[PDB]
Design a protein around this ligand. Structure first.
Ligand SMILES: *[C@@](=O)([C]([C][C][C])[N]C(=O)[C]1[C][C]2[C]N1C(=O)[C]([C]1[C][C][C][C][C]1)[N]C(=O)[C][C]C1=[C][C]=[C]C(=[C]1)O[C][C]O2)C(=O)[N][C]C(=O)[N][C](C(=O)N([C])[C])C1=[C][C]=[C][C]=[C]1
Ligand SMILES: [Zn+2]
Lengths: 22, 183
């Protein structure tokens, strides 16, 4: 039977940030 | 994390890449975050890392291994009745810690990185303050129910819907995790 595969992540540890201009 | 609960999602694998990895059982990708979006060849759900263990619903993962950089990994715990399975947390993930304040004001984090308020109404039940269509909760089993301080209270298990809209949610309280580990 096939393994369970991680296909993405949800990150709770992020804090508001000024999106760097680049 | 902590103060106001905010979350973001990032996709890391595609359909073909996921299939190959599911079969080879070897995932070389870097892991980050507390909640991992996972998939089998039949469905996609979530898995949450709490205290060093990656937990999810047995309804989704069944008794499968988790693809890792070292090959597939056997589950540490399995509890068909409690609907749980856990594997060692992937290297790179960050774990949540159980809630220690008995708050009845929960926040469910969905696979789309939305945190929706849920009012605790019974240890393993909570009502959606803002009913959402069932399709919105699909794919979020195994996701976390957080207390205002960002601590795991439970893992989303089932939607209490009617006519296609979910009014409430059933979840697996952290206490059952400890019980599954102890059992
Ligand atoms: C979860 O495992 C999933 C999320 C629910 C929206 N949970 C379930 O399927 C559980 C397992 C069950 C039955 N359910 C329910 O939530 C059902 C619900 C009824 C309406 C239609 C959806 C299912 N609810 C009930 O049975 C109510 C009775 C009840 C009340 C309390 C407790 C229980 C039952 O416990 C018994 C629970 O039994 C999840 O996210 N699963 C993965 C998933 O849905 N994946 C799909 C997918 O990958 N494909 C369809 C391919 C998905 C859909 C859409 C988007 C992304 C993924
Ligand atoms: Zn708490």
């Amino acid at each position: 039977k096939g393994s369970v595969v991680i296909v993405g992540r949800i990150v709770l540890s992020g804090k508001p940030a000024i999106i760097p201009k680049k | 994390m902590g103060a106001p609960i905010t979350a973001y999602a990032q996709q890391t694998r595609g359909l073909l890449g996921c299939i190959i990895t599911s079969l080879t059982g070897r995932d070389k990708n870097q892991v980050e975050g507390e909640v991992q979006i996972v998939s089998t060849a039949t469905q996609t759900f979530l898995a949450t890392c709490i205290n060093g263990v990656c937990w999810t619903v047995y309804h989704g993962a069944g008794t499968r291994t988790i693809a890792s950089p070292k090959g597939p990994v056997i589950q540490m715990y399995t509890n068909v009745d409690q609907d749980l399975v856990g594997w060692p947390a992937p290297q790179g993930s960050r774990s949540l810690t159980p809630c220690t304040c008995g708050s009845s004001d929960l926040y469910l984090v969905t696979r789309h990185a939305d945190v929706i308020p849920v009012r605790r109404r019974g240890d393993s039940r909570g009502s959606l303050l803002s009913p959402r269509p069932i399709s919105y909760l699909k794919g979020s089993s195994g996701g976390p129910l957080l207390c205002p301080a960002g601590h795991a209270v439970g893992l989303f298990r089932a939607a209490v819907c009617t006519r296609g809209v979910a009014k409430a949610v059933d979840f697996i309280p952290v206490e059952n995790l400890e019980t599954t580990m102890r059992s």
